[PDB]
């Protein structure tokens, strides 16, 4: 729980992006001209008032000051988007000069700064999208061996979601092999954007080919997720790290918000919204309230603050 401060660059010669500082003097690692590549830069609030005073004397950029005891990724993003009246923001940069130990921010994408100039821009949407994450396990299937959609209304609602310019990401924790048969039974390849599998487990991520039968164009959902917590518990969170990774692999580079729809609250690590799926061995046809929830969650920022 700390006070916090942020740079706002005068000329966003590169836009949307933000950086995080351990020292005000870290600027020396950045040196000449490199500063023009970042729109904002957060720093933990000065302990010495002279630092803040020198900041106040500096004219090279605008700045803001605030309290954020809420040491959370999404809450900090909310506060910054409030301060700078902006719906969408870029990635958070990092250097070999290791970041400050604000390691509660551990679970996120980390941008090796030099890539920033190398970054592409993407066709995939003409406007900045929202994103929604889904599962197979007990999720929107009926629970029997052969599954209906909980409503064909939902079936077509998935398609219409494209009208809003929002992204559909399914990561089955369930086993890889059966999902192909599942989609052959009911195909949403024309209805859904992104597919991932085998997330069920956390595994010892420490230092110590597919589509042979039918020409699917899928991939090894490679196990590249850290143990990340080095502790005795039982949790397999959905990983914003991996999600943003595959997004930028699809050149998806900016977004307004991300929501999770899942049967496990535990896996939600401060996702913007969570929809606990109702378990359903029969077609509940309840979707309209899910629709309402999602629509209002989207609408939150039409007032220019999520609340």
């Amino acid at each position: 729980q700390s006070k916090w401060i942020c740079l706002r660059l005068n000329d966003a010669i590169i836009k949307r992006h933000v950086l995080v500082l351990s020292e005000y003097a870290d600027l020396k690692y950045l040196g000449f001209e490199k500063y023009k590549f970042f729109e904002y830069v957060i720093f933990q609030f000065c302990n010495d008032p002279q630092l803040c005073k020198i900041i106040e004397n500096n004219y090279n950029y605008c700045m803001q000051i605030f309290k954020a005891p809420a040491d959370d990724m999404r809450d900090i993003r909310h506060n910054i988007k409030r301060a700078f009246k902006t719906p969408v923001l870029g990635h958070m940069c990092v250097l070999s000069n290791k970041p400050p130990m604000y390691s509660f921010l551990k679970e996120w994408f980390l941008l090796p700064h030099y890539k920033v100039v190398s970054l592409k821009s993407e066709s995939l949407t003409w406007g900045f999208p929202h994103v929604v994450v889904f599962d197979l396990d007990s999720t929107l299937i009926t629970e029997e061996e052969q599954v209906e959609i909980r409503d064909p209304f939902v079936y077509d609602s998935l398609q219409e979601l494209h009208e809003m310019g929002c992204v559909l990401v399914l990561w089955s924790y369930g086993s890889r092999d059966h999902v192909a048969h599942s989609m052959r039974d009911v195909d949403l390849e024309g209805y859904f954007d992104i597919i991932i599998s085998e997330g069920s487990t956390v595994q010892e991520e420490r230092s110590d080919i597919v589509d042979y039968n039918l020409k699917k164009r899928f991939i090894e959902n490679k196990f590249v997720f850290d143990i990340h917590n080095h502790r005795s518990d039982n949790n397999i969170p959905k990983s914003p790290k991996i999600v943003i990774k595959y997004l930028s692999d699809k050149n998806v580079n900016f977004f307004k918000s991300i929501t999770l729809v899942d049967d496990l609250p535990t896996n939600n690590y401060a996702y913007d919204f969570y929809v606990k799926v109702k378990r359903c061995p029969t077609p509940v046809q309840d979707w309209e309230h899910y629709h309402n929830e999602i629509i209002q969650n989207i609408m939150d920022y039409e007032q220019y603050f999520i609340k």
Binding site: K28, Y29, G31, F32, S96, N97
Partner: peptide, 21 residues
């Protein structure tokens, strides 16, 4: 590069020498 600021420091010492004389 991490090399970069070392190059800049070397240039700095260089010019610091140069200007005075």
């Amino acid at each position: 590069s991490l090399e970069s600021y070392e190059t800049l420091k070397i240039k700095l010492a260089l010019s610091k020498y140069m200007a005075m004389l």
